[model samples]
Target chain A: GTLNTKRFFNLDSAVYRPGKLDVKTKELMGLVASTVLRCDDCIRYHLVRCVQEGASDEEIFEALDIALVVGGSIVIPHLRRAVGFLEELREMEKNGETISL
Target chain B: SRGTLNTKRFFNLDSAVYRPGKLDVKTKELMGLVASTVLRCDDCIRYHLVRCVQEGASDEEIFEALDIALVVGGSIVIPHLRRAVGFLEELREMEKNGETI
Candidate 1:
């Protein structure tokens, strides 16, 4: 590993901490917003941390709702794509899979 | 005469190197994606996603990349991402995947 994941997460944590928001809520909102904005890299990276930090599926869905408010109908497909990714994660978990890349 | 319409100055006349790094084709697409996430530029998000596709990134990779953008950009970034990805999907479906439509 290049230790890049840690650095990436740290950078996000640092930026999000500035608003005095709780980490989970900050991450949730950040994820949804970034998804709406269509920053593929950010969306992929933050969601992993959000799950690691104990966010539930319901929480993730709620974040999507927030994204809808900001992004309107435009966010629908991206949110669906997110659902697919999460489903993939669930399948990986069921299969006891570990993804390095 | 072609008239004054040519005076709008959309293209750069200087050496190509003088342009902002982010405005180049590859960089512009990536930066546009980043800005969409961080700044929630919806129209830009749509445009960049298409550009990224043309630049040879896969759909999964593009989505994952947006996730990476979100970790740092959070909620503020989602609108732009939503815009870009949604537009790409729609246009791809409607016009046989023309980038400019």
Candidate 2:
């Protein structure tokens, strides 16, 4: 399939590359923002990236807490999904699923 | 005075929130726009929309960004999406007319 893969990679690199915020912290903020926005794909993507970046469960939860406070009760469902996804990721890790960055 | 008492912290936090961090200004604005859409905060969306446009985000770029917000927020964000469109039109018109550039 002929696609604009190069442009996509460029955008991705520009946005996610190391800057004032490291990749891990950027992914953490992205996780929270994705949850607040309520995009399941975005949430799952960032959650996996966060885990890959060595973010502790406590850190992930802390970011989610911030999202909850900012997004109010409307974000509860997404928050639940994030928690479930985290559990799933942990299970995958236990099963030795290689999570690629 | 009652209103300003505990609200000062919010203002302070907002100031800090919008500043350039590990994430650059444009990236931060993009995240803010997406989060505001999910939260369904019209004012926040408008504010971030202006910043996003001023930061040189093209209409295509904004639309792609909004795709993330829409997926995250689902139909609840549709109305906010309308608002974003109107605001983007206004901003572009203003720039065209030299009212803002």
Candidate 3:
């Protein structure tokens, strides 16, 4: 398990390093694609990463808008999920939950 | 001719969206391909696949891009992946034969 996990993390680290696109923008794009694909796990993961990278709510919503436009009506439910998750995180922040960044 | 005229505006919009920004054209194409995979848009997948190849993205690079798509898109993207792989094979063959893709 450790071996496979290490390999996976290595791959993730390699892909996520800064290149032509900065890490923040790449995470935002990942968030958008996750929303479009309806992957709750990925959406949550990238959402927090975006916030950690100093992305504002407006920027996050704009990325969602792009996902909605590109993925069409099918992504409506997933978009709602994203919105709900964001709100939940905000609530958590208000409740003094430690939200890094 | 009729189709081109009908969609000229959309083509323009698409061109603008895919244009170089903070992300280069190649990176954008990679992102676009991932989005297409998640959205299950076969035509979009093929379109971006060609662009990615034209941008000199190797098969390994393209496959790695697809790995991200698969992670976010889950098993649902498997079918679309088959088509993407088939298209990539076709493009590679065309290149081998020295035919313009």
Model 3 lDDT per residue over B12-101, tens place: 556667778677999999999999999899999999999999999999999999999999999999999999999999999999999998
Which candidate do you rate higher for lDDT, 2 or 3? 3
DockQ for candidate 3, C-alpha atoms: 0.03
In lDDT terms, which candidate is top?
A: 3
Model 1 chain A lowest lDDT segment of ten: A1-10
lDDT of 3 at B8: 60
Cα-lDDT of candidate 2: 0.85
Interface RMSD of each: 15.7, 15.4, 17.1
- Per the 3 Å backbone cut-off, how many clashing residue pairs does candidate 1 have? 41
Say which docking band candidate 1 falls in: incorrect
Model 3's alpha-carbon lDDT is 0.85
Better of 1 and 2 by TM-score: 2
Candidate ranking under DockQ, highest first, comes to 2, 3, 1
Model 2 CAPRI quality:
incorrect
lDDT of 2 by residue, B1-101 (tens): 46442255445556666678577888888889989998899999999999998888888888988999999889989989998999899999999988864
Off by over 4 Å in 1: A1-13, A16-22, A98-101, B1-101
lDDT of 1 by residue, B1-101 (tens): 54232222212221232234535565556656766667666665666776776776666767777887888788667666666577657755755645454
